[PDB]
């Protein structure tokens, strides 16, 4: 099985740098770019970049070019990230990502199925709605989000104290283990997501993602 | 669409970055994606006219 | 199996020229044949002409032979058996016994003997050639009435009151509230002005669930009116309802 | 036109009726092919017979042709409501185009609305009586004005009878008016004929 | 005039029916690496005698072009006679028909040669 | 007028699959000899006169992303350079430590 | 002028050369006289354009001991060439990656890439592909025997 | 009635017949260790296109059943007409005429079909 096994949370001075590991298992580790985005509470989560272990190729988001540093060992199969000049603002839970299709044929990065634990880090478009949303168990949730752009669009569940799960993908495709009860539509621009009979483990917050941007989430919790 | 038995004399020439000895393009400049708005598949752009 | 869309009315003096297009899409544009037929008034249905895609060869009828130009674009692909093409057409000298609705029709099959037989036809284009001015319509409110007291249902509407000339497209809601919707044809005045009627029959209880807006298009003035038709009835067998 | 159809031809329905197209020997009909098209007035034309006597695709069996040495014919049987229209035939070859016929008019054997002259038009000035007919037949109706119970013979104007979707008939009636005679007479009405039945309906605009 | 192998895929079926002879005479043609066009041409003549094998069972056998006594149902794409020859090309009809390919093969090789050579058995014993 | 089945054999009929491919590079290139330069050893030569039939009124869809000949064009590389490198020289007793300085510079 | 066909007309493009990693990706690598060449390709992509007389020489390393394809277990020494190894080509093509989470700004950035040595093959057969002949076609017409 | 393939080997000759196009139909059928199977059925087709040589040079082509003009010889065993397909097997009659099979296929490819196509190119040509 799949599994991207992370390092430990810590907490880190302004001006100082961080650096954090992902062991990658499971799988051929050459066949897929690893990914690296930072959630922040009540902020849409970034993307920072990805990097191929088959040359050991990356890609930076514009925002921390300068700044950060992605490698790997292909012995150990580890990703490692370096982040300097740290600031307040860089305060969030980092989580290294693995997309769903991954053969030796080709890929598709932007479908994360896999997910590390997360590591907490404390230094001291895709229009979603509702923010929020107060059901009770059995009711179905309607969430949406427009996009612009149009492309494979998929959506994550965070659930309290938990890294994010794969739910839906391509705007209609049901992963593993998600029962009929998720289902996806589309119309236009616009996507839904509807859950029906809800349960004490679908409440938490669900994001909307087209490539590497994502909504600014909708909490669902329990009424 | 033409159809042919044997395609035309293609060179395995390995390199990276800079295609080097390969079929120049036709008027424009050719620019191929799988994907413009995903930024992790490459852009393969191909000449016209062989830079030296 | 495809469809055939032209471009919109146009009014033309006579002696100038005028090209009229005809957009297909669904099927492959260059295996059938252009045919263009207008009926007037007066002389009844008459083929002008047709046009090949593929090759360009063109046979037009000795009417139309010195005063009829046929332009075709190249086929734009879509799939491996249907796509998206153009064809145009110019016709000078116009003069007062051309105004009609003209036609683009597809032929029905690609080899036999009636390859270039009009089989698919278009919507069509009304041709106005006048020297009598473009004349902006008069779109007034038609207020609501009774129409069943024991059913509680009412007929409000628009009025297109002279307007030069033919035609005008209404619609309601921008296109929202079909249902129900009556359009009458208009009357030939004595001066030479049309005027035509619409009327949508609604229930009495919508009132603050529902915006009333008529939708008066006319191309040939470029002008369009938006009216909010007020709910608020003056039918006395109506009000008893409310 | 040189192809002469039937001026006008009749049927009940579910019976047959036969439409002739001739003419002379140069356009019908030795070595000449002859199509047969449904063409209803304002609305886009149907292809129904190509070749003398071959249907087009997805047409009913309902329809059937037949081509003599100098005249061919369309025989529609089982008749419905929605085929009392016009049909024209066409003389046709591989080469040459179509020389369409004279036409022929297939015949196969009410709500009033009054709306008195809206309040911006009484500003202008100018009044207008519109009185709308729908959903009647077969289309043959009089319209006749009356102003304070008295017969109008000036501004009277009604549309043709035009078939509507629900294959029904629709008419409209106008009656120019003065702003001084709107205010002058008591009522106005607008009295409609339609087989012996007159109804009538009749707009007040003293209140 | 000879449009070469595949040269009428873009025109109708009955144009196409013109060129079988064409696309029939190409379809046979007469250490690792070396395996590599062994497996090929293997495949390529089971392919070939697996074709052969379907046209002989049924009833045709000589090959191009054969008739058989099988009503066309009309579910199967219910179109006209100068509706498939002269306005359909073969790929758009294979496109349609892909469903009841399998259906139509075996109303071929069964309900046929093996009902009406037991018949001619029967007559040819008088 | 009832319709009859007719069997067809030899419709440009063709459907997108993917199959061994098997290559092909000249005769000129054969005289360059050299112990087998690269790959052209048991190679068929290339046709003189290649024929190109342009397919009218065709119109086929391509895919240079979902395309099978790279694939194979790769795995042929990658087992032509372990065929090139099978029979040749192993330095197995050459990670002895080196007593290396600068050039003489 | 082609790429503003893409990402709007009036855009401000950037080239900037390798963000890092192995040396067969941050360098042009290739094969001359059985050398294998990294050169530097930051003189060539070190632009920035807006909406509206020599050689430029680039430093090559050269390396003996490689492993191309990411390949463990099959490590190849070059052997040395004798006399001075001179070689020309024809650049034809590029393989460019563009910098992501944009959002804000109207600039794009593009950087040289490479590492799946597929790109290269794809460069070359996007014009080419694989059908397989079926044929046994049926088809309805008047012909039947007794 | 369908006894499957090779249902009738204990039956007589004349119920045997019967089962013709069965035993026919199953006989074509449509790293190392794959290529024990690759062996096997090209050996398969070829022993296939033997038996259609052989059924083809003779004067039948028609496959299951022909006739010949070919007088039966009393030494091949002699036996009776109601004596063979009513009282034997195949298999029992293929083990007394295997001294002959070669002769007669001798006589069947020579003496036919060689000397009846060119008496029917001189009978065609008039
Ligand atoms: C190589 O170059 C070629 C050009 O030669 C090129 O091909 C064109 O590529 C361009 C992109 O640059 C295309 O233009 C885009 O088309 C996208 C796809 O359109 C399909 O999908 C539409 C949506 O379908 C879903 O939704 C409907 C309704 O809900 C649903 O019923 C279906 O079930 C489906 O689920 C679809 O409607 C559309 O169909 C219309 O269009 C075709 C013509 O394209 C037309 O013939 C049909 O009759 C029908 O009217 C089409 O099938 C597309 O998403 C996009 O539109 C979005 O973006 C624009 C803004 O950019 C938005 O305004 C718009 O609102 C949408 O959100 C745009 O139209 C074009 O389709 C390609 N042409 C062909 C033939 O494929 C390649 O892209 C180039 N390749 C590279 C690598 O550069
Ligand atoms: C893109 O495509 C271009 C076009 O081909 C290609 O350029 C080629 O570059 C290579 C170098 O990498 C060339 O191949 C070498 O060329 C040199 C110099 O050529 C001179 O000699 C000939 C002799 O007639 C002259 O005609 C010519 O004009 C030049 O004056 C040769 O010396 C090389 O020969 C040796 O090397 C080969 C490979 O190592 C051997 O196979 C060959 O047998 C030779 O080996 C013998 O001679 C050596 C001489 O010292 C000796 O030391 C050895 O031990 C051995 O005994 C070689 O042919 C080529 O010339 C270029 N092409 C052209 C048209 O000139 C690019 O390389 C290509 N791009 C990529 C990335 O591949
Ligand atoms: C590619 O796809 C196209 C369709 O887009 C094909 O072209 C059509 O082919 C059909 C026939 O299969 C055409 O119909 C014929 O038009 C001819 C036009 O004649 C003039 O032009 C030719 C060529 O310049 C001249 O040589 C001749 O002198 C004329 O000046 C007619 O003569 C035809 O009528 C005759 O044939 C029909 C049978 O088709 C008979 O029934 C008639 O009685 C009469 O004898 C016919 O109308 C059509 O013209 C073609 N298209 C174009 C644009 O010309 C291609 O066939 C297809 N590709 C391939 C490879 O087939
Ligand atoms: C790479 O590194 C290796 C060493 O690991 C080098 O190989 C050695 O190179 C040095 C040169 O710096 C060689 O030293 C020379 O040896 C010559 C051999 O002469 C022999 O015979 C004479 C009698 O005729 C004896 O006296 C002598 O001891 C030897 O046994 C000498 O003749 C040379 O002397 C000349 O040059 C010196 C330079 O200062 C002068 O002072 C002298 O007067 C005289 O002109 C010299 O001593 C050594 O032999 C090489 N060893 C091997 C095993 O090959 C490479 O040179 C080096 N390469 C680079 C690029 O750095
Ligand atoms: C065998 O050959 C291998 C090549 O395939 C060599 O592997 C590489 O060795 C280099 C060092 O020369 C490494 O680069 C360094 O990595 C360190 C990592 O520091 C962190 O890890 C160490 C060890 O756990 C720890 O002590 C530190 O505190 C850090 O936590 C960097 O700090 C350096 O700056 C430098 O980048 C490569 O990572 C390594 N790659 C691989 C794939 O192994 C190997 O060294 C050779 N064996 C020997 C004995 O030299
Ligand atoms: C990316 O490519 C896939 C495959 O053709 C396509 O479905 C998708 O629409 C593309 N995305 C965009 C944004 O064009
Ligand atoms: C013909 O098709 C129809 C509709 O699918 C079906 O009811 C009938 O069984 C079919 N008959 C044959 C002989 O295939
Ligand atoms: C033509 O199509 C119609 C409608 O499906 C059908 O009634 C008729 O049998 C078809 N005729 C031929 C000759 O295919
Ligand atoms: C093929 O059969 C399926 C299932 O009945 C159906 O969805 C599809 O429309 C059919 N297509 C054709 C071309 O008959
Ligand atoms: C890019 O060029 C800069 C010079 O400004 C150099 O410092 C850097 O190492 C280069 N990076 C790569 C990956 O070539
Ligand atoms: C490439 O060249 C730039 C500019 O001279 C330099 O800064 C950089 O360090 C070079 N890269 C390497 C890997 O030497
Ligand atoms: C890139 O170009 C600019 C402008 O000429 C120059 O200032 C800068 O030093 C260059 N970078 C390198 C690495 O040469
Ligand atoms: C490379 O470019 C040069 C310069 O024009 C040209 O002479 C040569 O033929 C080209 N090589 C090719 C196209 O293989
Ligand atoms: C028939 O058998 C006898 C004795 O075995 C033999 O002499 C004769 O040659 C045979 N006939 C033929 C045609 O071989
Ligand atoms: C029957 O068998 C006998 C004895 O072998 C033989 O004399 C006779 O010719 C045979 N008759 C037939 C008709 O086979
Ligand atoms: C087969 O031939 C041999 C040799 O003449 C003989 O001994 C044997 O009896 C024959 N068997 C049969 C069944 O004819």
């Known amino acids: 099985q799949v599994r991207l096994s992370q390092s430990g949370g810590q907490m880190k001075k302004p001006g100082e740098s961080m650096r954090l590991s992902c062991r990658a298992s499971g799988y051929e580790f050459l066949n897929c770019p690893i990914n690296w985005i930072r959630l922040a509470p009540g902020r849409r989560p970034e993307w920072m970049g990805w990097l191929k272990p088959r040359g050991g190729a990356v890609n930076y988001a514009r925002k921390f070019q300068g700044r950060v540093t992605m490698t790997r060992d292909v012995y150990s199969d580890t990703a490692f990230l370096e982040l300097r000049s740290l600031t307040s603002d860089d305060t969030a839970v980092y989580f290294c990502t693995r997309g769903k299709y991954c053969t030796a044929r080709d890929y598709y990065n932007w479908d994360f199925e896999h997910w590390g634990r997360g590591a907490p880090v404390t230094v001291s478009v895709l229009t979603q709605s509702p923010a929020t949303l107060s059901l009770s168990p059995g009711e179905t949730a309607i969430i949406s989000c427009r996009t612009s752009q149009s492309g494979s669009l998929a959506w994550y569940q965070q659930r309290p104290g938990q890294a994010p799960r794969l739910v839906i993908y391509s705007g209609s495709t049901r992963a593993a283990g998600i029962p009929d009860r998720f289902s996806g539509s589309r119309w236009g621009a616009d996507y839904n997501l509807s859950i029906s009979n809800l349960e004490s483990g679908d409440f938490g917050v669900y994001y909307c993602q087209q490539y590497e941007f994502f909504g600014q989430g909708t909490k669902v919790q329990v009424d | 669409v033409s159809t042919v038995q044997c395609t035309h004399g293609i060179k395995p020439v390995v390199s990276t970055q800079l295609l080097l000895n390969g079929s120049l393009a036709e008027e424009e400049v050719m620019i191929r994606s799988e994907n413009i708005t995903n930024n992790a598949k490459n852009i393969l752009v191909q000449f016209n006219t062989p830079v030296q | 199996q495809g469809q055939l869309v032209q471009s919109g009315a146009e009014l033309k003096k006579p002696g100038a020229s005028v090209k009229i297009s005809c957009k297909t899409s669904?099927?492959?544009?260059?295996?059938?044949?252009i045919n263009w037929i207008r009926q007037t008034a007066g002389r009844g249905p008459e083929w002008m002409g047709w046009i090949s895609p593929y090759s360009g060869d063109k046979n037009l009828a000795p009417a139309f032979q010195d005063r009829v130009i046929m332009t075709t674009d190249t086929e734009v692909p879509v799939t491996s058996f249907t796509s998206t093409g153009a064809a145009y057409m110019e016709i000078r000298n116009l003069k007062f016994d051309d105004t009609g609705t003209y036609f683009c029709?597809?032929?029905?099959?690609?080899?036999?003997?009636?390859?270039?037989?009009?089989?698919?036809w278009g919507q069509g284009t009304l041709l106005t050639v006048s020297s009598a001015s473009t004349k902006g319509p008069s779109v007034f409110p038609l207020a609501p009435s009774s129409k069943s007291t024991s059913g509680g249902t009412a007929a409000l509407g628009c009025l297109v009151k002279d307007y030069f000339p033919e035609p005008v497209t209404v619609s309601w809601n921008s296109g929202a509230l079909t249902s129900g919707v009556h359009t009458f044809p208009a009357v030939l005045q004595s001066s030479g002005l049309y005027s035509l009627s619409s009327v949508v029959t609604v229930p009495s209880s919508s009132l603050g669930t529902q915006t009333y807006i008529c939708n008066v298009n006319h191309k040939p003035s470029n002008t369009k009116v938006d009216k909010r038709v007020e709910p608020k009835s003056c039918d006395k067998g109506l009000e008893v309802l409310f | 036109s040189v192809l002469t159809q039937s001026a006008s031809v009749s049927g009940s329905l579910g019976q047959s009726v036969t439409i002739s197209c001739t003419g002379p020997n140069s356009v019908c009909c030795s070595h000449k092919s002859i199509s047969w098209y449904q063409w209803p007035p304002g609305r886009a034309p149907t292809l129904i017979i190509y070749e003398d006597n071959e249907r087009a695709p997805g047409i009913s069996p309902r329809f059937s042709g037949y081509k003599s040495y100098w005249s061919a014919y369309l025989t529609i049987s089982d008749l419905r409501p929605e085929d009392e229209t016009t049909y024209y035939c066409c003389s046709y070859t591989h080469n040459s185009g179509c020389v369409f016929g004279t036409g022929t008019k297939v015949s196969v054997l009410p709500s009033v609305t009054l709306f008195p002259p809206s309040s911006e038009e009484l500003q202008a000035n100018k009044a207008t009586l519109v009185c709308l007919i729908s959903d009647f037949y077969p289309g043959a109706v009089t319209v006749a004005w009356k102003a304070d119970s008295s017969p109008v013979k000036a501004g009277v104007e009604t549309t043709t009878p035009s078939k509507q979707s629900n294959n029904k008939y629709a008419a409209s009636s106008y009656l120019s008016l003065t702003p001084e005679q709107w205010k002058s007479h008591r009522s106005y009405s607008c009295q409609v004929t339609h087989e012996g039945s007159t109804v009538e309906k009749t707009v007040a605009p003293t209140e | 005039v000879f449009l070469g192998f595949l040269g009428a895929a873009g025109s109708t079926m009955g144009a196409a029916s013109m060129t079988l002879t064409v696309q029939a005479r190409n379809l046979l043609s007469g250490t690792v690496w070396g395996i590599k066009q062994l497996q090929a041409r293997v495949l390529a003549v089971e392919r070939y005698l697996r074709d052969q094998q379907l046209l002989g069972i049924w009833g045709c056998s000589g090959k191009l072009i054969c008739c058989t006594n099988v009503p066309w149902n009309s579910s199967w794409s219910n179109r006209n006679l100068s509706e498939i020859w002269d306005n359909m090309t073969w790929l758009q009809w294979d496109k349609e028909i892909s469903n009841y390919t399998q259906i139509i093969y075996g109303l071929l090789e069964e309900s046929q040669n093996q009902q009406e050579k037991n018949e001619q058995d029967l007559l040819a014993l008088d | 007028e009832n319709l009859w089945v007719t069997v067809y054999y030899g419709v440009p009929v063709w459907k997108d699959a993917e199959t061994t491919l098997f290559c092909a590079s000249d005769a000129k290139a054969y005289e360059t000899e050299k112990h087998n330069v690269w790959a052209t050893c048991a190679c068929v030569p290339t046709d003189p006169n290649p024929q190109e039939i342009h397919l009218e009124n065709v119109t086929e869809e391509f895919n240079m992303w979902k395309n099978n000949m790279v694939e194979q064009m790769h795995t042929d590389i990658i087992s032509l350079w372990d065929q090139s490198l099978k029979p040749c020289v192993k330095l197995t007793p050459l990670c002895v430590t080196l007593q290396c300085t600068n050039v003489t510079n | 002028k082609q790429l503003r066909k893409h990402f709007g007309n009036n855009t401000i493009i950037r080239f900037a050369n390798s963000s890092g990693g192995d040396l067969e990706v941050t360098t042009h690598s290739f094969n001359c006289g059985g050398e294998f060449f990294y050169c530097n390709t930051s003189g060539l992509f070190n632009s920035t354009w807006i909406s509206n007389n020599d050689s430029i020489t680039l430093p090559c390393r050269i390396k003996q001991i490689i492993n191309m394809w990411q390949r463990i277990g099959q490590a190849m020494y070059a052997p040395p060439i004798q006399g001075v190894i001179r070689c020309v080509s024809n650049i034809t093509g590029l393989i460019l990656t563009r910098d992501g989470g944009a959002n804000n700004t109207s600039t794009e950035t593009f950087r040289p890439g490479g590492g799946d040595m597929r790109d290269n093959w794809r460069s070359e057969l996007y014009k080419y592909k694989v059908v397989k002949i079926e044929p046994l076609g049926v088809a309805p017409t008047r012909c039947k025997r007794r | 009635v369908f006894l499957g393939f090779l249902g009738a080997a204990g039956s007589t000759m004349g119920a045997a017949s019967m089962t013709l196009t069965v035993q026919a139909r199953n006989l074509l059928s449509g790293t190392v260790w794959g290529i024990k199977q690759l062996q096997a059925r090209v050996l398969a087709v070829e022993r296939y296109l033997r038996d259609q040589q052989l059924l083809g040079i003779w004067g039948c082509s028609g496959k299951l059943i022909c006739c010949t003009n070919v007088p039966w010889n009393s030494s091949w065993s002699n036996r009776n007409l109601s004596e063979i397909w009513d009282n034997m097997t195949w298999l029992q009659w293929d083990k007394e005429i295997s001294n002959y099979t070669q002769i007669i296929y001798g006589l069947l490819e020579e003496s036919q079909n060689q000397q009846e196509k060119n008496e029917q190119d001189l009978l065609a040509l008039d």
């Open positions: 029709a597809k032929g029905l099959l690609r080899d036999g003997s009636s390859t270039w037989l009009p089989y698919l």
């Open positions: 669904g099927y492959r544009f260059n295996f059938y044949h």
